[PDB]
Design a protein around this ligand. Structure first.
Ligand SMILES: [Mg+2]
Ligand SMILES: [Mg+2]
Ligand SMILES: [Mg+2]
Ligand SMILES: [Mg+2]
Ligand SMILES: [Mg+2]
Ligand SMILES: [Mg+2]
Ligand SMILES: [Mg+2]
Ligand SMILES: [Mg+2]
Ligand SMILES: [Mg+2]
Ligand SMILES: [Mg+2]
Ligand SMILES: [Mg+2]
Lengths: 190, 138, 345, 199
RNA sequence: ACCGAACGCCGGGUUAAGGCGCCCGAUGCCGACGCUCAUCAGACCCCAGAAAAGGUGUUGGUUGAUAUAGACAGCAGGACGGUGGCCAUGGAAGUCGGAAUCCGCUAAGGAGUGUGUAACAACUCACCUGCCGAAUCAACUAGCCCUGAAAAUGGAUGGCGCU
RNA sequence: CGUUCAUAGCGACGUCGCUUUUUGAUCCUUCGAUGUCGGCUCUUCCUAUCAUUGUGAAGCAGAAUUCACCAAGCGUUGGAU
RNA sequence: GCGAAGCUACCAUCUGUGGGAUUAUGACUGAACGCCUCUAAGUCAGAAUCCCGCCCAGGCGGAACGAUACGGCAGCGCCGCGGAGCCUCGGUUGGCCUCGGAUAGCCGGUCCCCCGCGGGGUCCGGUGCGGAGUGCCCUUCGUCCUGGGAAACGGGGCGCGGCCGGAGAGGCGGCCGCCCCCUCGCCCGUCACGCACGCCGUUCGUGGGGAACCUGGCGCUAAACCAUUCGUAGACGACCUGCU
């Protein structure tokens, strides 16, 4: 049935400054800005407190599937806050029984050439989503680092280079190869 | 981003129905879509009333959620809602609209004549202003 | 019941109403996309199929069994004397389509061209563009022209140049030159329009438009073959000797019950004189015409770096059912659509 | 004497029915900005619904068979035609009163144009439901001239922004003019709020 | 051939059975309360179409647990001994199967859910805590929706359409 | 059954369906006649998919493979009796 | 026998293309359900599929431009302003425009900041069952006279020349010089206008659309088809060509 009211709060940290054009939260701080439009979620994004300390998300007369959005908006905002403060660092380790997947970034992070996967002549170039910057790490031999503010864009761009390196017409229980996401962390922890 | 609420003791204007064009304090909320309502001073008997037909003002007079009519009458008269309502812009444009409907054909003619002149005096002022402003631009 | 033994169907449906082409000169149905960056150029030309011949060449595709071997290769000669630009014409983008907006014609126009505007010339007084050319020599007209170009510069997007052939220079019987719109593709509309304005009443040879070893698409009407039976027109099976009411037919037009013969069934009708757009015909050689410095330079045509004779692409006794290719010509690999003497886009 | 409706924001069938009855009663109707018409139910739903309609064709000679117009204007015109007696003379006459346009061209661009609030999406659908823009739908089913219509509408919107700005500036002068003059219009202005305007 | 109603020729009224977005006369009611979204929605006797069986899709019911004596999932720590227990040897010391089937230590672990072993081993599956902070969870049942659900000209809630 | 393991692939005893490319029932239509088998020729449609495209499954190491999904675009031949 | 031309053969030779939406599927972020989940809101990849491209035909669908009957009788194109006279009818103030949003909007003004008189921002002040309201706005609807007041340089002469803006199907406006004429909106007085004797299609857009007819001014000076010819064409028509 219709639930007379539901809500949540998201305590923004004093480092960050969030502002909301109606239903379009813009979060800015140390690393940069992140906007996100929730026109499509249908909620009361209040922003209360002196020092602007917390974001409050109401949702009046919701049925069960409407009340599921309440939390999700809050969570995306959390991730948006994180991305502005710390940032996201997805580490992904290359795997192979033979063909040592030769990775090499190109323009800056942007492009990822993935040569000699399974002995294939076909070089897999893979773009990144704007803002995300791939980089080949040190202190770990076969391993990539994807950093960026917007988690969505980072994790998708990881998935691009995970699915790029896929094995066709074989027993994938046997042929375990490719670049896979090993650790989803931040750029800086505090 | 709401400013007006179905609160106990909110005065509301009944848009339409039998008790149209009347103020009414919400006594208590019965349901999703039905309020138990009163307007002692506005000639509206205690009864249930659907929210559909009532649009709600910016006047929350304070009484407890299921008082016995006497007390809401006192809260109405204490705040002097009838006087406050009439002074509001809303009530004035209701009054305006009523007057326009009542307007007789002689009255109508009088207005026509009055506007005919009144707009002409504005029009000359506007044209002059524009030409002078043209003078400022030059 | 189902057809027993499968076979693919005869002829394409992507080519039909197999009817006699309404045009004669083949229409450029779609010019290439102008990327506003590279410099301006004409996109199309208008030539005449003179004939065919061999070529010989060393081939350089590594891997093949024919790598560094001399092959022979059929070619068409297409006599393509230079085109004179006589008009320009602006187009505007609309949601309806691509409306033609403003056509400016040149001051002077040849009788080659004028010919085209009359169905009978002998009979006519040849009064075409008489009151038009007046515009080019006065204040009011020259001012009206300049505004029209400036309007085209403002509002139009696509600009095509109207060019026409120099029928004068061909062995053909007809004097009535073909006009044609040719799309200018290049920089901004203004720059495009100034270039066309500069080219007005001027020659445009082939070598400007096309280079050598360039793939081009030939567009023309097919050699027409009159009314033709279903066995010629669709290459259906001939029925066997015994068939009582003729055997150059299709036996079963259609099933009973969609009780109408379909548009997909093979019937007899016009075979040929269809409009057709062939693609990827490699220009092997753009040739120079005959010219004079003291005596004739007939050599420059069919002489090569390895032959060095004094030949013209004209074979002995001329090209058959045509004439002497005296003018500049291209030389396409393979055949091209249409008969001899046929105007070819 | 001529209804011009802004097809934007309206429901395909819901606008059509209102247009249809008006057209039958002799009113000349113009519907404009048809690409902005939007149809209930998700996009994919309605794409498939169109692609079925495309499959319907006269097997033996498709040239006769149902003419699947791609243009959003012509789509709207088709659905309106479905709500007329369009085989009759009166039905045809009625259809000839109707006039429908992709985007908003020059006679109607400088005309104030109404909105049917009974066919309006904001009113008629729940806010958690999905709907399809009839521009996209038309675009994906064949319609060629989405991009062209789009660019022309930018130009139109820019030209309209100016017009509005000038209208605002005049309205501002009018408001100031009234304040300049409010002692020599006082006993006219008084009577225009006894009989109930200005208030 | 169903439902209503049975016909001289007309005016006014009123109905039936059916209807009232538009085609098409009538809801252009500020109609009332719910339910349902379907990448095959659904849409009215006869009638022109679907079943068993499924579904934390959503909505109601019914019956029961377990719980500040600190749940329930989620992050983690042990899982024994009397004991190769007995039948079965072809090997089953918990473990192809089956009769059994209790005690100790107990905080507590079945003479054992499985993985797997020739057989073990090794691993895995209560009772209790540490963190976190209010409801949690189970089995039925019935509404709408979905799966189940395949035909040959292009096609029919009558059509347009409708959320 | 499948060494083991109900369900990879199967599936008894039972049970619920769809189809009109089988054959029966039936006798509504046509007996002042709808030319009665096959083959040849030609088009089109269906999918209950053999192949080909993209995929999920395995008792898929590879190769070969069956099982399933989107899918009817394109194919699906030459002969002996 | 041999055989030109012409037809003609995988029996010779040449050419056969690029995108978009997504399906199955695999994924992302992520609730529902402190965890988990491809999904619920949102996002990604994705195909012999589908739609388009190229390609063929081109609508009782449009386009720009050319030329527009010298004449031996001609006949017309514009422009402006006049008289009758068939016919076809519908109508019976206008509205000259932001964009859009909807769990939000509209207007101001910026003291202050940035951008090209405007645009964008912040801040503040007003509105918001919308009165800078389509529940709206504009316009008035008898004619004249004279003789006061408030309002007063506004209107006209299809008044006349220049400079603009407008191309999506422009079809409309705007702004600037000069000539002559008038005193029009709002109140009052002051009379008079066939007052046709109670009675229907009145009242306008209207100088309407079309067809036939009388005046001025400035312009014009044909193509098409047949016949003939040709063979890139052809059953016949059609088509491509030629002809002081
Ligand atoms: Mg294999
Ligand atoms: Mg077959
Ligand atoms: Mg015989
Ligand atoms: Mg098409
Ligand atoms: Mg009965
Ligand atoms: Mg077994
Ligand atoms: Mg027969
Ligand atoms: Mg299938
Ligand atoms: Mg998916
Ligand atoms: Mg995609
Ligand atoms: Mg794609």
């Amino acid at each position: 049935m219709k639930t007379i009211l539901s809500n949540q709060t998201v305590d923004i940290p004093e480092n960050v400054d969030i502002s909301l054009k109606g239903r379009t939260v813009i979060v800015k701080g140390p690393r940069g800005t992140l906007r996100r439009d929730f026109n499509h979620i249908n909620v009361e994004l209040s922003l209360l407190g002196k020092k602007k300390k917390r974001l409050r998300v109401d949702k009046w007369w919701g049925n069960r599937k409407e009340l599921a959005t309440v939390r999700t908006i809050c969570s995306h905002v959390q991730n948006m806050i994180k991305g502005v403060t710390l940032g996201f660092r997805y580490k992904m380790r290359s795997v192979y029984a033979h063909f040592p997947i030769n990775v090499v970034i190109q323009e800056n992070g942007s492009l990822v050439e993935i040569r000699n996967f399974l002995g294939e002549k076909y070089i897999r170039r893979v773009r990144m989503r704007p803002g995300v910057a791939c980089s080949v790490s040190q202190a770990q031999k076969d391993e990539l680092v994807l950093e960026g503010n917007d988690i969505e864009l980072v994790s998708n761009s990881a998935a691009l280079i995970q699915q790029a390196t896929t094995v066709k017409n074989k027993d994938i229980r046997k042929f375990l190869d490719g670049i896979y996401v090993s650790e989803k962390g931040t750029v800086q922890q505090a | 981003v709401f400013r007006r609420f179905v609160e106990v003791g909110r005065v509301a204007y009944v848009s339409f129905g039998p008790h149209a064009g009347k103020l009414v304090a919400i006594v208590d909320v019965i349901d999703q879509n039905r309020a138990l309502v009163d307007g002692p001073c506005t000639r509206v008997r205690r009864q249930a009333m659907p929210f559909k037909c009532m649009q709600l003002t910016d006047f929350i007079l304070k009484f407890p959620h299921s008082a016995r009519q006497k007390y809401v009458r006192k809260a109405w008269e204490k705040a002097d809602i009838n006087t406050k309502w009439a002074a509001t812009r809303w009530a004035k444009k209701i009054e305006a609209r009523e007057r326009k409907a009542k307007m007789t054909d002689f009255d109508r003619y009088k207005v026509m004549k009055a506007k005919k002149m009144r707009n002409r005096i504005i029009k000359n002022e506007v044209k002059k202003l524009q030409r002078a402003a043209l003078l400022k631009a030059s | 019941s189902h057809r027993k033994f499968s076979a693919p169907r005869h002829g394409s449906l992507g080519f039909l109403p197999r009817k006699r082409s309404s045009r004669h000169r083949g229409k450029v149905k779609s010019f290439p996309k102008d990327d506003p960056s590279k410099p301006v150029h004409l996109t199309a030309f208008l030539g005449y199929k003179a004939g065919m011949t061999h070529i010989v060449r060393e081939v350089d595709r590594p891997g093949s069994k024919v790598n560094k071997k001399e092959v022979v290769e059929a070619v068409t000669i297409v006599e393509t004397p230079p085109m004179v630009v006589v008009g320009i014409v602006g187009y505007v983008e609309t949601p309806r389509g691509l409306r033609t907006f403003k056509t400016v014609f040149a001051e002077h126009i040849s009788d080659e061209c004028k010919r085209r505007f009359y169905k009978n010339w002998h009979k006519s007084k040849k009064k075409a563009f008489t009151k038009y050319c007046k515009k080019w020599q006065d204040d009011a007209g020259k001012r009206q022209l300049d505004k029209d170009f400036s309007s085209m510069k403002k509002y139009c997007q696509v600009i095509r140049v109207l060019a026409h052939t120099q029928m004068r220079l061909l062995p053909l019987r007809q004097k009535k030159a073909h006009l044609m719109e040719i799309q200018v593709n290049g920089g901004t509309v203004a720059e495009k329009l100034d270039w066309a304005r500069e080219r007005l009443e001027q020659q445009v040879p082939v070598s400007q438009v096309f280079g050598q070893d360039e793939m081009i698409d030939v567009i023309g009407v097919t050699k027409g073959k009159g009314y033709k039976g279903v066995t010629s027109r669709w290459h259906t099976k001939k029925l066997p000797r015994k068939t009582h009411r003729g055997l150059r037919k299709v036996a079963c037009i259609g099933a009973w019950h969609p009780a109408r013969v379909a548009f997909s069934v093979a019937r007899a009708g016009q075979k040929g004189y269809h409009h057709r757009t062939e693609i990827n015909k490699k220009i092997y050689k753009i040739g120079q015409g005959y010219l004079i410095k003291d005596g004739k330079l007939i050599k420059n045509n069919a002489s090569t770096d390895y032959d060095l004779s004094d030949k013209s692409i004209n074979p002995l006794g001329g090209f058959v059912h045509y004439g002497e290719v005296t003018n500049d010509f291209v030389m396409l690999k393979g055949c091209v659509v249409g008969t001899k003497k046929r105007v070819l886009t | 004497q001529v209804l011009v409706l802004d097809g934007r924001g309206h429901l395909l069938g819901r606008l059509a029915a209102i247009v249809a009855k008006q057209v039958l009663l002799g009113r000349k109707v113009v519907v404009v900005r048809c690409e902005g018409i939007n149809i209930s139910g998700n996009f994919y739903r309605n794409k498939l619904k169109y692609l079925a309609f495309l499959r319907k064709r006269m097997n033996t000679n498709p040239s006769r068979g149902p003419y699947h117009f791609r243009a959003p204007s012509r789509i709207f015109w088709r659905t309106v035609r479905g709500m007329l007696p369009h085989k009759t003379k009166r039905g045809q006459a009625a259809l000839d009163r109707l006039k429908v346009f992709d985007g908003i061209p020059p006679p109607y661009d400088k005309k104030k144009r109404m909105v049917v609030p009974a066919a309006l999406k904001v009113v008629r659908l729940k806010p958690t439901r999905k709907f399809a823009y009839l521009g996209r739908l038309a675009h994906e089913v064949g319609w060629k001239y989405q991009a062209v219509t789009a660019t022309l509408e930018e130009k139109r919107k820019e030209k309209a922004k100016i017009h509005y700005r000038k209208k605002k500036q005049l309205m501002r002068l009018r408001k100031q003019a009234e304040k300049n003059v409010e002692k020599k219009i006082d006993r006219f202005t008084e009577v225009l709020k006894t009989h109930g305007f200005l208030v």
